[PDB]
């Protein structure tokens, strides 16, 4: 059996909203140490990696390890039937995942049930990055929305001083400069090009943390990281335009 109960179920809700618009289906690794997910978008330009530590749930049980094949459109939709104040539980009896939504008043309970799939894992080895920038989540989100109205790609340029996001298009060019809550840990200056289309999928993760961390090194994917308080992280990786 596998049974994870989560008092703050709104995390699941926010986790799936941030996933459903990037990746359709993904594999959920359940072990003693919690939930791991690792998945590329349908065009192999990006990769998502979610970690939900087992000690982050209210109850956590896992007899055997499970590689659950999940339709994230379906799971999103179900999770929309959870209220923000519901206690969410998941249950899998070793090809069906159940979701139970327990309302505060203890007089409304919702059972939802969803057929699981058989899905076929590399990953991005962690490095030292030349630049690493911790900035407010809302700000990085706003910078991406803004700049996608000017061009398709954003040149990120990082010095010890600050970070500069630039896009140009047919209707002019723009630059947004930030200085040093914004914190840079440069060990070498970087300059890279990424697709705004993809960064704006990532920023659906914004309600999970008031902060985001961008990690850059030359000619290697960007890492856009959202810390899920006392549970783990949602990590996005995006290949560069060269």
């Amino acid at each position: 059996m596998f049974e994870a109960r989560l008092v703050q179920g709104s995390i699941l809700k926010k986790v799936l909203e941030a996933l459903k618009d990037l990746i359709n289906e993904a594999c959920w690794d359940i072990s003693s140490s919690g939930v791991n997910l690792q998945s590329m978008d349908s065009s192999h330009v990006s990769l998502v990696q979610l970690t939900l530590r087992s000690e982050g749930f209210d109850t956590y049980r896992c007899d055997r390890n499970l590689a659950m094949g999940v339709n994230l459109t379906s799971m999103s939709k179900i999770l929309k039937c959870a209220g923000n104040e519901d206690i969410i539980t998941l249950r899998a009896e070793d090809d069906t995942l159940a979701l139970v939504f327990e309302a505060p008043n203890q007089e409304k309970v919702s059972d939802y049930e969803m057929k699981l799939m058989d899905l076929d894992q590399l990953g991005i080895p962690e490095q030292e990055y030349s630049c690493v920038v911790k900035m407010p989540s809302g700000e990085f989100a706003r910078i991406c929305r803004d700049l996608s109205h000017i061009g398709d790609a954003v040149v990120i340029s990082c010095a010890k001083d600050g970070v500069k996001f630039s896009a140009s298009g047919e209707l002019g060019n723009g630059n947004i400069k930030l200085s040093q809550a914004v914190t840079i840990e440069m060990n070498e200056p970087v300059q890279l090009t990424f697709a705004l289309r993809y960064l704006n999928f990532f920023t659906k993760a914004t309600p999970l943390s008031s902060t985001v961390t961008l990690s850059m090194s030359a000619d290697v994917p960007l890492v856009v990281e959202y810390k899920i308080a006392d549970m783990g992280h949602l990590k996005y990786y995006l290949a560069p335009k060269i």
């Binding site: 192999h44 330009v45 590399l122 290949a239």
Partner: peptide, 10 residues
């Protein structure tokens, strides 16, 4: 010009 993240995968 867009690289795939295949290749960075290990």
């Amino acid at each position: 010009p867009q690289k795939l993240i295949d290749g960075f995968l290990k």
